[PDB]
Amino acid sequence: LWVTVYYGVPVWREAKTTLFCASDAEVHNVWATHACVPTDPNPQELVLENVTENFNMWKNDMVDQMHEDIISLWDQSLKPCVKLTPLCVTLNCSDAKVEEIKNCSFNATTELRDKKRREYALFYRLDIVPLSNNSEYRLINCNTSVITQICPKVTFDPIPIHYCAPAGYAILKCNNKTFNGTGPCNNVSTVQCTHGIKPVVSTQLLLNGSLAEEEIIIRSENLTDNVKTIIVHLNESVEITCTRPNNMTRKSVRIGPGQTFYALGDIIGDIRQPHCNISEIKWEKTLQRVSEKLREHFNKTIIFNQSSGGDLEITTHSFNCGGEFFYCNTSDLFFNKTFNETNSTITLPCRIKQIINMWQEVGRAMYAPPIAGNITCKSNITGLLLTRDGGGTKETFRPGGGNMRDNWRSELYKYKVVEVKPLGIAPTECNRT
Amino acid sequence: LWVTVYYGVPVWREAKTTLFCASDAEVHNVWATHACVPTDPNPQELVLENVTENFNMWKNDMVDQMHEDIISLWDQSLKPCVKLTPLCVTLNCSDAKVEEIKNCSFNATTELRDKKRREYALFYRLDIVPLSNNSEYRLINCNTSVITQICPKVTFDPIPIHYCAPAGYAILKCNNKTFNGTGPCNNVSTVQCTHGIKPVVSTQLLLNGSLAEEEIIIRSENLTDNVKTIIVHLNESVEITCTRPNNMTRKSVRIGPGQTFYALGDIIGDIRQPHCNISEIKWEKTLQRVSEKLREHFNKTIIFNQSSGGDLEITTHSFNCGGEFFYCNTSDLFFNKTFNETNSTITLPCRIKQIINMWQEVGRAMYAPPIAGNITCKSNITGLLLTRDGGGTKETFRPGGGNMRDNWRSELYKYKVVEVKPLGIAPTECNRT
Amino acid sequence: LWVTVYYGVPVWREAKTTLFCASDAEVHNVWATHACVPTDPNPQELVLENVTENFNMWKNDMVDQMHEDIISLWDQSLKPCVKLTPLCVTLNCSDAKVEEIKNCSFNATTELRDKKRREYALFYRLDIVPLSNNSEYRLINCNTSVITQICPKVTFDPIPIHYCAPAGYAILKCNNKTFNGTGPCNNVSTVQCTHGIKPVVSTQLLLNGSLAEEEIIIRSENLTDNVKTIIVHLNESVEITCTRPNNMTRKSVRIGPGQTFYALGDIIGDIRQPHCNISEIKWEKTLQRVSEKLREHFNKTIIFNQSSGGDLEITTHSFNCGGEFFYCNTSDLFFNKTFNETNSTITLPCRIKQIINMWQEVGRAMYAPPIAGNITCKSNITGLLLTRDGGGTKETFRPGGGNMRDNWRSELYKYKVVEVKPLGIAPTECNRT
Amino acid sequence: VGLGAVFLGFLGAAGSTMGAASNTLTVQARQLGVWGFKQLQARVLAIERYLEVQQLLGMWGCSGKLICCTNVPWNSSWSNKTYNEIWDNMTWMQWDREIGNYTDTIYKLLEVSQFQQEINEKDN
Amino acid sequence: VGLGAVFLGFLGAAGSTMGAASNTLTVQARQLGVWGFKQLQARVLAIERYLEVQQLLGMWGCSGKLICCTNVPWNSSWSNKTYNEIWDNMTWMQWDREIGNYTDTIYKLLEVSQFQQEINEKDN
Amino acid sequence: VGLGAVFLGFLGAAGSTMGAASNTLTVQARQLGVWGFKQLQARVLAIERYLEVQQLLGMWGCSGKLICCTNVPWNSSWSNKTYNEIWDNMTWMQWDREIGNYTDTIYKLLEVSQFQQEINEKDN
């Protein structure tokens, strides 16, 4: 009968805001710079009851606040160490005698810019480009981009970061198990900040991600599209094992006054390939279970096929392992198989690059220093990245990444940030007497 | 009879504070970086009644908060693109064969610092200095200042910015028509933020400014002075038309690894002068109407005269047009005329410079890339910049700019920022019973 | 009988927070950049009554917030001036003819990078290192660290800065006279911000510090230790006088386009040593009074001895004077004397360095420009820095600095920052009726 | 710490009826880096969201009252449902659709109807 | 949004008499970049100017009362004009000249005379 | 200016008895650079320390009352000394040792016992 107000009513509104880091509590690190708030030892999640809120996955904002600050993080970390500007000259490379690795010998300047020692290093064939053959090479992209090297003390090992909304905001979180990526889900719980998100970098097969619950989820945006990718979440973790058995020996060389970097010296013993491993019976059943969950959304037979080709960042399985950047073939005994109706091991050949152009842009090109001794990393494949062919009979799926934001859109497929509006207005009997 | 307080009383005090941007809502831009708050679609101005507040024009603070952040804006924008440090060597220039433009040929380094191609460019005679003639030139100021170039994607077109005071402050605004620049005006209105201010850069004749109301205003500080300039606001907009009819062809050259810039290639067709145009009957009456409004403040005859001379940033009409920096003569049929008691066109000769030292300082010197094809910009001359001779019979006015803050002191001649003090104290009858 | 609350109760808690500057209100300066709040003309100190609070000196946090921001201050100030990267080449130095100062002659690049003039300068023998003698030197550390020079306009004269806690915090201050460095003192007074702290830089004898009150204080952490230093505060100020009587002539040389620096030209008149002076009777009694205040804490005889040796930043008395960095011998007639039971003058030989590696780190190495004419600075020695030998009869004290944080731990030996918690809870008779 | 935890705590029973959110709250209330700039940008926004609703409360004669009861008549052009229809057959999120276009005309009306209480009865 | 708009709205009729500003207010109240650092420096100052006057109100026993009426006697060494002379023949800007040198001695007097109200009557 | 000066002014007689700090307060109350970032980091913390204690006051039905008197019974498992033993034979710093482990269980109890006052007597 009269207007009254109410402080603290459950009313929210979708908005866009600025989140922050929270690590789980001492060498420097590019992801968590040891400047993050400590997390809650027991996070308080408030389960809501009998409410259906619809939210989009692809129209999120946290996946754009995650691709920006990671770029700023590598920009902040690769600043105070040495750029390899005076490195690339007319190199004189033949081969190693231990075609994959070339023995380059060039003229670097010593600590004072009046003498020139000829110094030798070892580079990969995927890292130098010729000029004429006649064996005169140069570094791969010191014509479009200035090239810096990684400061050798820092690491790249992804420790999980939590994204906390500011005080006065809320982060919804869907708790439904079989949640298709866009729509209303009816088991919603608020949380101040999300679970541990490892900022993993891969482009073909997702690594170290959280598994699904009790089903195989096929997340997409338009399933009648050709350029829109298909994220295939998983609930059966398939273990991958990637290693290189060569014992590399790093070597310090000085190029400028106070400016040095590290390059590969000689290789110990017989040279062997860097390869990855996938158990065959843990992979054939995984492709079959994905194939049945894809047949019902197209009502025709599906057949996997090879990647497209071209540059070696699209037709490969690029990932990071222990401080080294791999580029594996991933299209030999995985993606030439159809589906009708022994403890073997699939070995993938894999090649290593030193100079990498991450996030496929120009103006930024980091250089990875070599790592002494062998490395071996065992991981979990929870997630794929498929793409329709463009036909329209049967179906053909090129395994190929669309972007790197889709690599974050698997750990952020169930979160939306909202702003509470705790002022309510209702009519009642009382008046201010 | 007892002290009582009052919240929200109309009491202000003059202060100094920090304002911010507001644009009118996508290539990058140096003025509004697309990081500004959106303006009010209808600004709320509160007209005051029956109050006289006196404020100074020359003792303002917004004109010092405008010369600082613009310097910081160009500092922020000219950072991440290439400096022309390894460019200037012993150049070997003769002439163009299409004296004003020289055909320079020099030794730049290629993408790797071991080979040297001889590359040719075309420069202006106002941009290189000789060394002996014998035809060996160098760039104009790579002995006092490191020289950078403009990042070629950004533009210089002045979109108007609004200056908003923080919440809890007020910006007064005089609404009197015939407001001499310093004194009490009796029609004051508060506004949260001012109108659209185009951050135009000129030094001789003001461009694209807001006209006066119904009179010609002669703003000064001391009219019995010789070094203090005289801003002459206008109410009759005189149109200027400045163009160059040559079809320039830009050309990319590479000087370093990942470091390239653009220079003038060959010129299409017959070479023609860059000139400006001013209608004669729209200018003779404008000088006569200014002359009568200057005679009464000196009570002697006035006679305009030429500029002083020396460097070509003082005796010229320097301005920006479409991404090119002009330097026109402005002293041919404008400033050799006295005042007693046909649709012609005055053409001013005008010369173009590439390397400019804006804001007449050392340590900063930007380089403008050439613009392909012709340009033509039509503008409004609302405002002059005169200076007394220093005699003491008659009077002589050298048209010449004193600074660049005076270029902002025409759009900020009627604004003063104040801080409200909403606590009042008065005696009344009540007491706290 | 019922819970009631109280706003504003005297309850504090030790914490860690972020303090700020306050100077005593125009060339640029590295310490106070003319961006600091003005101090109180009369600071309000609130003396507490009948309370004993124990606080540690060595476990402070302000001495770690003082070593960090000073590093950031020199990082901010040495940024926008020229680095001496293209300076160090194969130098060709013989001697000066006016062994201490060498006449070096090298090939610098002129304003355009195509010609090379041979230019001569004068360097110190403590500043170049040979290469073979055969007289081919180079600069001292352009192999580990990039070397920049000081921007020549700024000064190093330490004006005192005050450290103010944020609003809502308190800084305790002990007022006891004979306060041993760690323990409970019973005359405590709060102050918003501390007294004037000159940010002096020395490593052997403390300079320009505040004297003690009425006693000699022997501050330490573990007096039965060997690596923990011994700060010996003083109450008798001993005057030092340090000067160089040579009339140096600076000279500008240009190394790059827009890149110049200053070096020593010729020396006027006969060369004389730079020396320091200490009155003998004002020093013998000072060592005797310190010796008696050290005998009772060890109950054996003590004997001072020479420094250890090695590099010339540990076995010296390094300090700054008028823009020049000295390195004096300090171990001739000071530290070879025991203690049993004429107006002379002790002269210390002292050598000057140009290139200094302050704060004994790598990656940072500033270069000091020379100062035209003689300099003379008179100062007060209030404080020593001793170190036990490591024996265990008698006792031997090597005078030698442990760090540079101990140089701040004499002016911050009586301050601890706390956070007030003004909410109190007590039972009383009233209830909310 | 207790600057946004209460804001998250307001969202208990966000799907219940409007006549139960005042009842079923007591049943649940029984028991320079990059991030150095992100945290500063977060803390300023966290302060500003609290102060905006604090000034909006402070203009209506109640600055800490939860169920603040004001003397403004209910204009029935904003809603036409009765008290028993609204308070027992609607959730609090659904009410913001019906009231969602008369917000500012209620806010300014509440401000001037509170200003009249200070002018009339106290001193003048 | 309503954090400085009311501060600008206080300036209505800044030249009227002091006895009309309490009357003629209801007649008018009827209806990381460079700028990324300028906006942060502006927002901190906008919060601080509101909190300073909020603490100055909160020390005087009224934290949201507009016409707060306090029990302090009027010392006539500060002003000598009567109520009818001040309130009907002066504007609010002109009052700050006469009261402009006794501000802090009134502020501390108001603080201690409010502290006496908490000590005396309530519990002690 | 008066945003932390009162915080420093609370520390008068920090060693006196608890029954004298409410008495002996009236006897003493009678009369972009590096530092550009340090001052901003200081001012945000100075605002946040005031707003935290302001919300902690505002949840207990008193938002400017100094000696706020609440209707919560005294659980004697927190302390066992009487009123005359505590208030005349203890300083205010020494009380925070005995009460120092029952703080949050008193804070939440005060919040819900203030929430009951709004639910019960006013409207519902």
Ligand SMILES: *[C@@H]1O[C@H](CO)[C@@H](O[C@@H]2O[C@H](CO)[C@@H](O[C@@H]3O[C@H](CO[C@H]4O[C@H](CO)[C@@H](O)[C@H](O)[C@@H]4O)[C@@H](O)[C@H](O[C@H]4O[C@H](CO)[C@@H](O)[C@H](O)[C@@H]4O)[C@@H]3O)[C@H](O)[C@H]2NC(C)=O)[C@H](O)[C@H]1NC(C)=O
């Ligand atoms: C996806 O998830 C997998 C999970 O297995 C990750 O694999 C881990 O990768 C990290 C990074 O390479 C490995 O951590 C490294 O292990 C090295 C060997 O560990 C030995 O020592 C530890 C000590 O507790 C034993 O527990 C362990 O069993 C081994 O015996 C260490 O040497 C490394 O530490 C230090 O190494 C050198 C010094 O020699 C330093 O320079 C380094 O900076 C570092 O401080 C390091 O801890 C980890 O072992 C792997 N887990 C395994 C093999 O189970 C993937 O990295 C992850 N991410 C992807 C694929 O992107």
Ligand SMILES: *[C@@H]1O[C@H](CO)[C@@H](O[C@@H]2O[C@H](CO)[C@@H](O[C@@H]3O[C@H](CO[C@H]4O[C@H](CO)[C@@H](O)[C@H](O)[C@@H]4O)[C@@H](O)[C@H](O[C@H]4O[C@H](CO)[C@@H](O)[C@H](O)[C@@H]4O)[C@@H]3O)[C@H](O)[C@H]2NC(C)=O)[C@H](O)[C@H]1NC(C)=O
């Ligand atoms: C003082 O005020 C005058 C007002 O006239 C300003 O003059 C304007 O200056 C701007 C900047 O040079 C001119 O804008 C440019 O116009 C070019 C030609 O415009 C054609 O296309 C538009 C499309 O709507 C038509 O409306 C118009 O009539 C023309 O047919 C455009 O080509 C430019 O756009 C783009 O050009 C190239 C691509 O070719 C890009 O590289 C550019 O970045 C840009 O995005 C541009 O819009 C404008 O035309 C002028 N007004 C006129 C002539 O009336 C002065 O600049 C101003 N300031 C001073 C003097 O300092």
Ligand SMILES: *[C@@H]1O[C@H](CO)[C@@H](O[C@@H]2O[C@H](CO)[C@@H](O)[C@H](O)[C@H]2NC(C)=O)[C@H](O)[C@H]1NC(C)=O
């Ligand atoms: C909605 O989601 C919540 C959160 O996952 C579920 O609550 C959990 O249910 C499991 C199994 O019943 C319990 O072991 C947990 O203790 C529950 N709580 C939490 C916080 O995890 C809830 O069951 C879901 N409800 C529906 C209808 O799907």
Ligand SMILES: *[C@@H]1O[C@H](CO)[C@@H](O[C@@H]2O[C@H](CO)[C@@H](O)[C@H](O)[C@H]2NC(C)=O)[C@H](O)[C@H]1NC(C)=O
């Ligand atoms: C004081 O200035 C104001 C603002 O310019 C004038 O108000 C405007 O007057 C014109 C012409 O009378 C109207 O068309 C506008 O509607 C008025 N309001 C606004 C907001 O522009 C006012 O006339 C001036 N008064 C005096 C005495 O000069």
Ligand SMILES: *[C@@H]1O[C@H](CO)[C@@H](O[C@@H]2O[C@H](CO)[C@@H](O)[C@H](O)[C@H]2NC(C)=O)[C@H](O)[C@H]1NC(C)=O
């Ligand atoms: C505790 O320290 C304070 C501060 O030094 C002393 O107070 C000063 O004492 C001197 C000498 O008696 C006076 O001249 C000053 O006026 C006092 N006040 C100040 C603010 O300096 C006090 O005497 C000391 N008390 C004890 C017991 O040591």
Ligand SMILES: *[C@@H]1O[C@H](CO)[C@@H](O)[C@H](O)[C@H]1NC(C)=O
């Ligand atoms: C590579 O070249 C260097 C000299 O350039 C030579 O000493 C070395 O033996 C070569 N081979 C290997 C495997 O390093």
Ligand SMILES: *[C@@H]1O[C@H](CO)[C@@H](O)[C@H](O)[C@H]1NC(C)=O
């Ligand atoms: C291989 O690398 C490991 C890694 O530390 C090293 O210890 C070992 O000496 C290397 N060589 C051989 C022959 O194992």
Ligand SMILES: *[C@@H]1O[C@H](CO)[C@@H](O)[C@H](O)[C@H]1NC(C)=O
């Ligand atoms: C300028 O010089 C280049 C070679 O330096 C020559 O090829 C060209 O013809 C010359 N003339 C013009 C107009 O470019």
Ligand SMILES: *[C@@H]1O[C@H](CO)[C@@H](O)[C@H](O)[C@H]1NC(C)=O
């Ligand atoms: C002149 O410049 C214009 C600008 O785009 C271009 O289109 C044209 O081809 C050029 N040449 C001639 C002959 O017009």
Ligand SMILES: *[C@@H]1O[C@H](CO)[C@@H](O)[C@H](O)[C@H]1NC(C)=O
């Ligand atoms: C030092 O060397 C220069 C030439 O390198 C010479 O002109 C000069 O006389 C020498 N002596 C002194 C004292 O400068």
Ligand SMILES: *[C@@H]1O[C@H](CO)[C@@H](O)[C@H](O)[C@H]1NC(C)=O
């Ligand atoms: C010594 O230095 C002073 C310092 O300014 C200077 O004035 C003087 O000319 C120099 N030479 C002599 C011979 O004093």
Ligand SMILES: *[C@@H]1O[C@H](CO)[C@@H](O)[C@H](O)[C@H]1NC(C)=O
């Ligand atoms: C469950 O939903 C019903 C109606 O949809 C609602 O009345 C009830 O309050 C909900 N449960 C809870 C615990 O809020």
Ligand SMILES: *[C@@H]1O[C@H](CO)[C@@H](O)[C@H](O)[C@H]1NC(C)=O
């Ligand atoms: C505006 O009010 C109408 C009622 O006529 C309502 O239906 C609508 O949802 C409101 N909001 C809009 C148009 O955003």
Ligand SMILES: *[C@@H]1O[C@H](CO)[C@@H](O)[C@H](O)[C@H]1NC(C)=O
């Ligand atoms: C106009 O001025 C008179 C006296 O100067 C004043 O009484 C009146 O209030 C003013 N008008 C308004 C609308 O305030």
Ligand SMILES: *[C@@H]1O[C@H](CO)[C@@H](O)[C@H](O)[C@H]1NC(C)=O
């Ligand atoms: C101080 O008080 C006097 C009254 O004696 C007054 O005239 C003056 O304006 C005040 N303010 C000053 C001096 O700033």
Ligand SMILES: *[C@@H]1O[C@H](CO)[C@@H](O)[C@H](O)[C@H]1NC(C)=O
């Ligand atoms: C001095 O100490 C006694 C007990 O230690 C205390 O009662 C008294 O209040 C103290 N003095 C003051 C001024 O607080």
